[PDB]
Ligand binder design. Sequence first.
Ligand SMILES: CCNc1cc2oc3c/c(=[NH+]/CC)c(C)cc-3c(-c3ccccc3C(=O)OCC)c2cc1C
Lengths: 91, 459
Amino acid sequence: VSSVPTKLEVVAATPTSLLISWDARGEYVVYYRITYGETGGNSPVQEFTVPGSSSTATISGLSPGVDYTITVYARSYYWGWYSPISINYRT
Amino acid sequence: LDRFSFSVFLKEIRLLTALALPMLLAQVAQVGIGFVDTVMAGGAGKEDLAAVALGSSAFATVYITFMGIMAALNPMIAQLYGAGKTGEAGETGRQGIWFGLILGIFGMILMWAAITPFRNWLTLSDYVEGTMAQYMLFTSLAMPAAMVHRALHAYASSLNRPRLIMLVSFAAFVLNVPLNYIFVYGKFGMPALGGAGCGVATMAVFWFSALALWIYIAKEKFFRPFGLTAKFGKPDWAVFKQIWKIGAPIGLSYFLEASAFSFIVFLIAPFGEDYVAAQQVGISLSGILYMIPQSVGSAGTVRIGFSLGRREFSRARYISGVSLVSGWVLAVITVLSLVLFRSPLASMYNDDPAVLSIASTVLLFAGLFQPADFTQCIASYALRGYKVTKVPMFIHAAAFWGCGLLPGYLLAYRFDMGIYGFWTALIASLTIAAVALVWCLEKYSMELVKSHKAVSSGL
Ligand SMILES: CCNc1cc2oc3c/c(=[NH+]/CC)c(C)cc-3c(-c3ccccc3C(=O)OCC)c2cc1C
């Protein structure tokens, strides 16, 4: 029962790959799954996954300048999901 | 073909409350040092041919120049006040204090070499040399630039809420003025060598203000990590080599005002002489209270690079404006007390020995360049000051010299009573900065769109 890992930022890429640096004030019971694909709908989804106060990490950014949407995921108290938040801002 | 300096004014919402006002007491602890100087300009008056400035301002060549580099961590360390470890941020503060001591021992070494003003090609009191106990301000006070970089690597680490330096660089100056003379001729002290010994005094207090750093791992948590300052990381260790291209770009760009050194002191060189070498109770009064001006940005330079770590993207560079502009209020509301007011019946014979019976064709650039430059560097200590961007800000000033190269010999040939006449494209060379820079501070507060890669969040 809450709202999301509520920051948004992807500062820039390394015009192939990207930095994703978002809010994490602690963790919770702790954990981040981060979604992985464009906004195309086609090119299936993938998953980075991280620990501590670290939704503040960085992707494998394969494909070129192509639009890319990727959410982070809270995990908590209940081994369930404290809400998810996304931006789409590609290469 | 019209605006390649983008959307101009936008540096405004409701920021009427930009309180980069302790970033005044960063440069009012810099009047604090600016003003020992006079107390040994008219301290070494006791000695007559102690015109001593004859080394003391040809020393502070490889001070303010090397000093450029050093105070070039001003972002380095404030910007990692949006990281966490003041002592990884501080193992720079250290890694550099190694620098400020290491390039400090080049001041202290290129100063050794320095001592051969046994050289001559043009005009009296700028070659002449009869008696030189300058000999010794050249060393007794050029043996200091080791400790004295570390004594700036101090306020190159008051880039994060303090000026415990206005504390010291006051009771630093007071400490020196007793001292100052007890060497020129003194007491118990080594009382003799007095024309150099105003500087063995000066330099003695660089070393005291050197440990007015050491003494301020005192009021809270650490900036003490002087664990072996060492480098080595590949062929040669950065966070040091990183200091490198903030440093070069600024020193070699403090070689702006380093030929605003050989322009200005080579147009007293025709039969211009008299009131044209009074272009120094003139432009030494630029310097004088141009220092509190200019250097709000050379302090505001924190509250931008700082609010880059603390990821407030242009919630900082759109304070870079309402800081550009706020002493740009005083830029004009004291470009008025400059072309207006004189050097009147309270000017004795101080920082430069010449007052009564000369012309105000010296106030005729106390406007020209005056607020059309005021800020045209504080736009740099906000560029660089914010970002990397002195990278060729370096090449900012490759014009503010090479553009006013020819309005150098364009007073000596003048159309008007052009005493301010090579201050032509050295006020127009010098407001091609109203552009060059503050063009990259709207190419630049336009990179905190590119960078601000998520415009707002959830809730
Ligand atoms: C508050 C700062 N006050 C300053 C006061 C100064 O006073 C000076 C007096 C002199 N008279 C002795 C009879 C001579 C010859 C040079 C001087 C220089 C000077 C000398 C040689 C080369 C360059 C400069 C120089 O830096 O000029 C800038 C005005 C100088 C510089 C600064 C900065």
